[PDB]
Amino acid sequence: MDQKSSSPQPAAQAPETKQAFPRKFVLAALEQSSDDAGWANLGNFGNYLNKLQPDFDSRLYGYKKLSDLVKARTDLFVTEERQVPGSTQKALYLRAKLEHHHHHH
């Protein structure tokens, strides 16, 4: 529940560290850090994720923080800002992006 904004992002920067995304461990932490409805709060996600993968660092991918990594790589992760009941600020909730059964003929 947020403002669906986007950005071209000019690739004028010199290519820094390129690392692969290990999604099995990350999604494993994500789902375990999720509430009953299947949404994980950014804070708890960044916490439980590091428990499974301490080697997983955002600067290895070129991002300022894990938060920016997730909202950028929405292909792997589903991102929404959700309002917390009784709180003044909204919290970023995350969940796993999965395919759908596709076939040939």
How was this structure determined? It was done by NMR
Asked whether residue 49 is domain-assigned, the answer is yes
Asked whether residue 78 is domain-assigned, the answer is yes
Discontinuities in the chain with C to N beyond 2.5 Å fall right after none
Note whether 94 and 27 are within 8 A (CB). no
d(CA 79, CA 57): 19
Asked whether residue 103 is domain-assigned, the answer is no
d(CA 13, CA 63): 13
Note whether 92 and 77 are within 8 A (CB). no
Residue 87 belongs to what domain range? Answer: 23-97
Asked whether residue 2 is domain-assigned, the answer is no
Asked whether residue 4 is domain-assigned, the answer is no
Asked whether residue 79 is domain-assigned, the answer is yes
Q: How many domains does the chain have?
A: 1
d(CA 31, CA 45): 9
Asked whether residue 102 is domain-assigned, the answer is no
Asked whether residue 69 is domain-assigned, the answer is yes
d(CA 73, CA 52): 20
CATH number where 55 lies: 3.30.420.610
